[PDB]
Amino acid sequence: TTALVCDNGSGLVKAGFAGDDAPRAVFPSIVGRPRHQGVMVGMGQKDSYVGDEAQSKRGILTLKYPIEHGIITNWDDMEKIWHHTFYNELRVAPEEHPTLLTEAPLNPKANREKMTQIMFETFNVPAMYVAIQAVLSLYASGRTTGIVLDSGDGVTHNVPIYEGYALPHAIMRLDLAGRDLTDYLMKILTERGYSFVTTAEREIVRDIKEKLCYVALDFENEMATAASSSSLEKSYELPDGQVITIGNERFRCPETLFQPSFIGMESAGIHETTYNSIMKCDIDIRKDLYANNVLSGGTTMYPGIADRMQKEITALAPSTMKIKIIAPPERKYSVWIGGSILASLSTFQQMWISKQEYDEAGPSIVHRKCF
Amino acid sequence: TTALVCDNGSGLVKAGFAGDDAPRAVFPSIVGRPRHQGVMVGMGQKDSYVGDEAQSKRGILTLKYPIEHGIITNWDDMEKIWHHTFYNELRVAPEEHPTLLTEAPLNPKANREKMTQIMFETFNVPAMYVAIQAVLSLYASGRTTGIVLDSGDGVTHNVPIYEGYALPHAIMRLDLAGRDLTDYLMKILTERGYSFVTTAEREIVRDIKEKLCYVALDFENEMATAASSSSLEKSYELPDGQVITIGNERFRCPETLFQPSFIGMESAGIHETTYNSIMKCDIDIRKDLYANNVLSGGTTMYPGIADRMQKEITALAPSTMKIKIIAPPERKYSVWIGGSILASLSTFQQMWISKQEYDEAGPSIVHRKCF
Amino acid sequence: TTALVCDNGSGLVKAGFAGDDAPRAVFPSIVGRPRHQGVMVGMGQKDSYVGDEAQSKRGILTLKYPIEHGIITNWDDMEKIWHHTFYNELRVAPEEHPTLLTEAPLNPKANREKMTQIMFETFNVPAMYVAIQAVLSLYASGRTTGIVLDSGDGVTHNVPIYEGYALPHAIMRLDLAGRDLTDYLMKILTERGYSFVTTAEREIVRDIKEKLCYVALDFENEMATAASSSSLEKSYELPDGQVITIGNERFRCPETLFQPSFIGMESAGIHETTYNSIMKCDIDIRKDLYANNVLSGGTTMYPGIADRMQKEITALAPSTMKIKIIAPPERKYSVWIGGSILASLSTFQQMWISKQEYDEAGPSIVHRKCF
Amino acid sequence: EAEKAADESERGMKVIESRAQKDEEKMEIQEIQLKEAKHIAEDADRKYEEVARKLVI
Amino acid sequence: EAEKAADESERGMKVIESRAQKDEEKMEIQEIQLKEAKHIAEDADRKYEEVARKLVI
Ligand SMILES: Nc1ncnc2c1ncn2[C@@H]1O[C@H](COP(=O)(O)OP(=O)(O)O)[C@@H](O)[C@H]1O
Ligand SMILES: Nc1ncnc2c1ncn2[C@@H]1O[C@H](COP(=O)(O)OP(=O)(O)O)[C@@H](O)[C@H]1O
Ligand SMILES: Nc1ncnc2c1ncn2[C@@H]1O[C@H](COP(=O)(O)OP(=O)(O)O)[C@@H](O)[C@H]1O
Ligand SMILES: [Mg+2]
Ligand SMILES: [Mg+2]
Ligand SMILES: [Mg+2]
C-alpha cells in the first residue's frame, strides 16, 4: 500500500500521497453557509459549501475558518473539511491508507487527542502519525542542523535543531501571523477611503496583500521617499471595478512582523525572537545555527524579507559571524515536501500508531514515545 | 612482533607502537551521552560518542571523564575508551600484540588488578605490564638519577631515583593537578562577569587556561603591576563571538600550584613538596638530586614555571648547592617516549606477564614479585 | 542615630530600620513605562511608575525587572528604585543614616563597586556596608553552624559555615530560582489552552504559582494518581473570570528544583548540590552540617519541600547519620532579620565604610579587609 | 517605456553583479591578509613576551 | 511583467549598494587594524633586537 500525507495547516489545506514531489490538492480551509433566504424552488441548494467551492459563491456566504491559531475551534467544520479532502479532492478511501498529519508546537494535548480519535473512529484509518511542522520543513530543506522559522497564516514559531537533536527549551512561539497582517491591512486601508468589513471582502484584502505588499529594507528611508515621491503607488482591480491605488500602505502592512507594536502586541519582532532563540541554545552550536537559518511558510514569501532579516540579525549578532539565510522558492509547500520525504522512509514504517495500539491504550497513546 | 604502549593518564589517552619516535594517536579521554531526545528519524544516532568525536558534539552531549584522580571510577567507560583506542585510532587487533601500561604511584591495588583482569579477559592480549609514569619519564630524559615531577591532569607526584634505585619512602603524591586549575579558573572568571557552568564549556575554559595562563616570577610585583597598569590584559575569542578579556586572572590560575590554599587544600606548594622529598632521602645523594630535577606532564608547560620553581627551590636549598631544572620541550609526551624506549629494550622481553602465567597464578600475579 | 537595612533581592525589595522585628516596606522591584499613546490632555501622566504603584496599572504599562540573576543589568532603574525606597516608602532622608546592603555570593566585582559608588555619590550616605545573604540568614536563625540554602527569585546558593568560619571553596551557586519556575509554569500551562505572553500576565502566573503549587513527596506515584483519579484538580479564579483548572502541573512546576533537566539545564537538583557541598568540606564537621541544614529565601515555601529534601538527603547520606532540616515560618524575610540583628551589634559599628575612607581609597576599598 | 526600463534593468543588474563579484574577490583577499596580519601580530607579541621574561630573569 | 522586473532589479541594486557601503567600512577597519598590527610588529622587532643585545651582554 501507499501512505497519505495530509497537512491541515491554517487557511490552506494541502494533501497528497507520500512519495510525490508536490501536493495534489491545495484549497482554502473555509466552510460557508448561505445567509439569505432563497426564492427559487427546485434547485435545492445545499446547506454547507466547503473548500474551494465556497470561494466561487463568496458573495452570498459567511466564510468561517474552523481554526484560529493552530487550535481547532469548530470540530464539525473540521470533519467537513477532512471528508471533502478525502473524497472530493483525492477520491480515495482512507480505509486502506495510513495518514500523516502535521501539527504546530506548543498546543493543547486535547487537540491531538481529538484529532487522533476522529481519524480512528470517523474515517477508520488503519494507522496514523502526528509530526511537528518545523521538523518536516528541515527535512525538505536538505539540512540536518539550523534553526527554522515557520510562519504560516495561523502562528509563527522557531524550532532549533542541531544534528537531529531538538532543543525544546529554546522553542519560541509567536501568535502573529498572516491573518493579523490582513486585519491590520484592513485597519490601515480605511485611512485612505476604502472600507472592507464583510467576511467576503477578507479574501479581497488578502489577495491585495499577496499581490502588492513587500518588506522594506529600511523603514524611515522608505517613508521619507514615499512622502515626496509617488513612484511607490500601484493600482489594483477589484472584482467589480473602481481601481484603488495604495502608496506607503503596501510596505507598512508586513512591517508588523518586525514591529509588532503596530497592532498592540507586547512581544518583539521575528528578527529578535530568532536571535533570542539562538542565544537560548548552548554556546557550542550557535555558529552552526547562525550559518543555517532556514525559512518556511507562506508568510515568509514577501519580497525582500530575507535581506531585511539578514540585516537585522547581522546587526544583533557579533561582527565575526557569517549570517546566511536559506529561502528556497518553494517556502509555502516546504512542510508538505518534508512530510512526503518522512513518510517515504522505510525505517518510519514501525513508528505508525496502529489501530490495535489505539484500541488497547486509548487516545492517550499519542503522547507516548510515538510523539 | 611489536609492542603497544598505551598511556591512559587522565583527560588524554595517547598510544602507539613501541619503537616509534612519537605517539601515533592522541585524543581526549571522554565519553559523551546525548541528553536530548532527537526528532529526526532514520539517522540512527549511537548511544555513546567516545574519543575525539565527542569534542565535535560538545553542544548536545554531556561529558564524563572515566578517570577522576589517577584511579578509574567508571569501568564501562574505560573499556569503551580502550576498545576505541585499539580498533579505530590504531586499527590493530590486540590478539597478537603485547601492551605496556602506565599508572601513578600509590594507587589502590584493586584498580591494577581489575585493569589486568579486563585486559586479559576482554581483549585477550598475549602479555602486558604496568610501569610507573615517572620511571618512564626518567628513561625518556636520558638520565639515571635525579627526581622527576610528573604533574598531569589527574595527580602530581615526585619520585626520587638515584642510580636506578628507587626510594619508595620518599615518594610524595599530591592530588592538585590540571583539572583543579581549570575548575579554579571557572570559579574566578565569574568575578569578571563570565559564567561557565555546563560541562561542555569546561573545555572552552581549559582552552583559555592553556592559551593565556602563565606563571609569574613574583606574585606581589605582578599583582601591583596588573592593578596599576593594563598591559597584561589579553582577549580571547569564544566559539560564538563576544570576545572576552582576562587581566589579573591570567596568572592567578597557575599560582594555585605554589599556593594550594587558594582552593582550600592544606598541603604545601609544589616547590615545598619537592624540597621535602629531596631532604627525605639520604645525605650522600642530595647534591645529585638537586642537580637533576626533571619536569614532565602537561601541567608543567606553563611559560615561566621553570624559572619560578628554580628560584623557590634555590631559596629553600642551601646557597652552596647548584640547582638545575630540566625542562625539555616535549614534557607532555615524555612518559610515552620513555615507555616506548623501555618496551624496545631486549632485556625487558622476559619481564612480560604471559597469559598462561596469569591463568596459573590468578589476577594477583601483578602485585607478586613477578611485577 | 539608626541604620537602614535595604535588601535589593530580585523582584522584591524589602527595607526598614535596624532594630525592628520585620521590614516596614515590601514591594516588587519593577519599573513600568506607558506603552500606549494617551488621549486625555491635562492628565499629568508620569513616564515611569516604580514599586507597588506599577502593580495596580499592569494593564497599561510594560514591566522591566532591573535584576536578571543577582546582577543589576540596568542602573537607571535601580537608581529610581532606591530613590523611591528612600523617599516614599521609608520617607527618611538618607543623608543621616548608615545603609546596609546585601548581595549574592560570587557576584561580579563591578556590580558591587558601582553599587557603592552610586550610594556614596547620589544619595550621599555617611557610611555603608555590603554583606552576604547566607551569613545574615544564619544570624537570623539563631545558629552559628550549618549549611544554609538561600533560594530567592534570582539565584540559589549554598554557603557552609562551621563555628563562624566560612568555607569559600565549598560555595555552590545555581541560577535556577523563582523566575525560571514562573517561566516553566507559563510553558506548561499551554498544555490546556491558557496562553500568558504579556509581562502583565507574568504576575498572574506568579500568583497562581504562589497560591496553588506544591512539592510532591514522590513524582511517579503522584503522576499516576493524577492520571488515574481526579482529586488534585484545583480551580483558580482569574481577575475577570473563566476559572482555570490545574491538574498534575500543580506539582510538576516545582519539580524543576529537583529535576533541572526539565528546563534543559545540565546541573543537578538542589538536593544533590547540597550533598556535593557537604562532601566538599572537611570530614570532622560533616555531622554538624548534616544536623543543621538551614532553609531560607522566598522560593522555599512550597508545601512539602522540607520533607522531600530530607528524604533525598537521607537517601544520599550514610544510614548511621541523622539529617535535620530547619524551616522557620519566616523564611522569606530571614535575610532582613539577620541584617537588622547584625546592624544592631555595637561591635559592628567599627566595620562601617566611612565616606572619608571611600574618598581616600576609591571604589576599590570595598574589596579590602572591610569586605 | 516598459521595455526601455527592462533593458535599463538588465544592463544595470549586469554591471552591479560584475562589481559585486569584484567586491567578493577583494573582500576575500583582504580577509586572508587579515589572517596573516593577525598571525604575525600575535607571533611578535608572544615572542617579545618570552624574550622579556628571559631578560628579567 | 516589465514593471515587476524593474522592481526586483531596483531592489537588487539597492541591496548591493548597501553591501558596497558595508564592505567600505569593512575595508576601513581592516586597513586600520593592518596598519596597527604592522606598527606593533615592527616596534616589537626593534625592541627584540635591543633586548637580544642586552641578553648577550
Ligand atoms: N506571495 C505571498 N506574499 C505574501 N503573503 C503570502 C504570499 N503567499 C501566501 N501568503 C500568505 O500566507 C498564508 C498561507 O499560509 P500557509 O502556508 O497556508 O500557512 P499554514 O501552513 O499554517 O496553513 C496566506 O494567508 C497568505 O496571506
Ligand atoms: N601549555 C599548557 N598550558 C596550560 N595547561 C596545559 C598545557 N599543556 C597541558 N595543559 C593541561 O594539562 C592537562 C593534560 O595533562 P596530561 O599530561 O595529558 O595528563 P594525563 O597524562 O593524566 O592525561 C590538560 O587538562 C591541560 O589543561
Ligand atoms: N508559597 C510560595 N509558592 C511558590 N513560590 C513562592 C512562594 N512564596 C514565595 N515564592 C517565590 O519567591 C520569590 C520571592 O522570594 P524572595 O526571597 O523575595 O527573593 P528576592 O529577595 O530575590 O525577591 C517570588 O518570586 C515567588 O515566586
Ligand atoms: Mg504551515
Ligand atoms: Mg600522565
Ligand atoms: Mg534574597
DSSP D1-57: -HHHHHHHHHHHHHHHHHHHHHHHHHHHHHHHHHHHHHHHHHHHHHHHHHHHHHHH-
Query: Do A141 and A132 form a contact (C-beta atoms < 8 A)?
Result: no
Residue A239: all three cell numbers together? 472584482
In this structure, the strands spanning A241-246 and A49-50 are: unpaired
Helix (H) or strand (E) holding B174: strand B172-174
Residue A212: all three cell numbers together? 502588492
Residue C190: all three cell numbers together? 499551554
Residue type, B13: V
Residue E39: all three cell numbers together? 606598527
Distance CA C224, CA A116 (A): 23
For residue B168, the SS3 value is helix
Distance CA A246, CA A224 (A): 16
CA dist C182 → B357, B359, C31, C253 (Å): 65, 62, 19, 8
Q: Among A343, A98, A19, A113, which residue's Cα sits nearest to residue B41?
A: A343
Query: Do B177 and B151 form a contact (C-beta atoms < 8 A)?
Result: yes
Which of A72, A113, A162, A266 to mutate: most C Cβ within 10 Å? A266
Beta-carbon neighbour count of residue C42 at 10 Å?
A: 5
Distance CA A315, CA C343 (A): 49
The residue written with cell numbers 531560607 in the block is: C296
CA dist B371 → B132, B157, B340, B350, C361 (Å): 11, 21, 18, 11, 65
Which chains share 3+ C-beta pairs under 8 angstroms with A? B, C, E
Residue type, B42: G
Resolution (A): 3.4
Binding site members of B for ADP: 10, 14, 153, 209, 298, 301, 332
For residue C47, the SS3 value is coil
Q: Among C147, C189, C191, C194, which residue's Cα sits nearest to residue C166?
A: C147
The residue written with cell numbers 465556497 in the block is: A54
DSSP β-bridge partners for residue B156? B151, B174
Helix (H) or strand (E) holding C254: none
Distance CA A5, CA A98 (A): 8
Q: How open is the CA angle C70-C76-C81, to the nearest 5 degrees?
A: 70
CA within 13 Å, CB half, B361:
18
Distance CA C284, CA C281 (A): 9
Query: Do A262 and A255 form a contact (C-beta atoms < 8 A)?
Result: yes
Q: Among A4, A17, A24, which residue's Cα sits nearest to residue A95?
A: A4
Q: How far is the CA of A104 from the centre of ligand 5 (A)?
A: 53
A332 lines ligand 1 (CB under 6 A): yes
Helix (H) or strand (E) holding C106: none
The residue written with cell numbers 499613546 in the block is: C37
Chain A positions contacting chain E at CB under 8 Å are 217, 303-304, 307, 311
Alpha helices in chain E (DSSP H): 2-56
Distance, C-alpha C352 to centroid of its chain: 25
Query: Which DSSP string corresponds to A185-197?
Result: HHHHHTTTT----
Smallest CA–CA separation between B327 and chain A, in Å? Answer: 35
Q: Among C96, C122, C97, which residue's Cα sits nearest to residue C18?
A: C97
Query: Do B366 and B112 form a contact (C-beta atoms < 8 A)?
Result: yes
Helix (H) or strand (E) holding C191: none
| Burial tier of C287 (Cβ tally within 10 Å: 0-12, 13-18, 19+) | exposed
**DSSP secondary structure code for residue B365 in this structure:** G
Through-space distance between the first and last CA atoms of chain A, rounded to whole angstroms: 24
B154 lines ligand 2 (CB under 6 A): yes
A11 lines ligand 1 (CB under 6 A): yes
Query: Do C140 and C338 form a contact (C-beta atoms < 8 A)?
Result: yes
Distance CA B241, CA A134 (A): 27
CA dist A167 → A162, A228, A334, A344, C265 (Å): 8, 48, 21, 26, 11
Distance CA A2, CA A87 (A): 17
Q: How far is the CA of C23 from the centre of ligand 3 (A)?
A: 16
Among B107, B210, B213, which is best to mutate for testing ligand 2, by the most ligand atoms less than 8 A from CB? Answer: B210
Query: Which DSSP string corresponds to A34-91?
Result: E-S----SSS---S-EETTHHHHTGGGEEEE-SBSSSSB--HHHHHHHHHHIIIIIS-
Q: In what order do the strands lie in the sheet with A61-64?
A: A49-50, A31-34, A61-64
Through-space distance between the first and last CA atoms of chain E, rounded to whole angstroms: 82
Can you give the residue range of the structural domain that contains A217? 178-256
Distance CA C21, CA C13 (A): 17
The residue written with cell numbers 540559589 in the block is: C156
Smallest CA–CA separation between A172 and chain C, in Å? Answer: 10
Task: Indicate which CATH number applies to the domain containing B244.
Answer: 3.90.640.10
Which residue is closest in CA terms to ligand 3's atom 9? C298
Smallest CA–CA separation between C105 and chain B, in Å? Answer: 10
CA dist C365 → B225, B230, C94, C305 (Å): 18, 19, 21, 41
Residue C148: all three cell numbers together? 544554609
Smallest CA–CA separation between A26 and chain E, in Å? Answer: 26
Query: Do C185 and C257 form a contact (C-beta atoms < 8 A)?
Result: no
Query: Do C54 and C29 form a contact (C-beta atoms < 8 A)?
Result: no
Helix (H) or strand (E) holding B101: strand B99-103
Q: Does E8 touch chain A (CB under 8 A)?
A: yes
Distance CA A63, CA A261 (A): 29
Using a CB cutoff of 8 Å and minimum separation of 24, what contacts does D15-18 make? D16/E12, D16/E13, D16/E16, D16/E17, D17/E16
Query: Do E30 and D34 form a contact (C-beta atoms < 8 A)?
Result: yes
Interface of B with A in 22-41 (CB under 8 A): 34, 36-41
CA within 13 Å, CB half, C182:
22
Which residues have CB under 8 Å from B360's CB, separation 6+?
Answer: none
Residue C110: all three cell numbers together? 563591578
In this structure, the strands spanning B172-174 and B241-246 are: unpaired
Do chains B and C touch by CB distance (3+ pairs < 8 Å)?
yes
Beta-carbon neighbour count of residue A265 at 10 Å?
A: 17
What are φ and ψ of residue C58, in 5° steps? -65, -25
Which of C71, C103, C106, C169 to mutate: most B Cβ within 10 Å? C169
Which residue is closest in CA terms to ligand 1's atom 3? A210
| Burial tier of C223 (Cβ tally within 10 Å: 0-12, 13-18, 19+) | middle
* Cα dihedral sign, B40-B42-B46-B47: positive
Annotation-wise, does A80 bind a ligand?
no
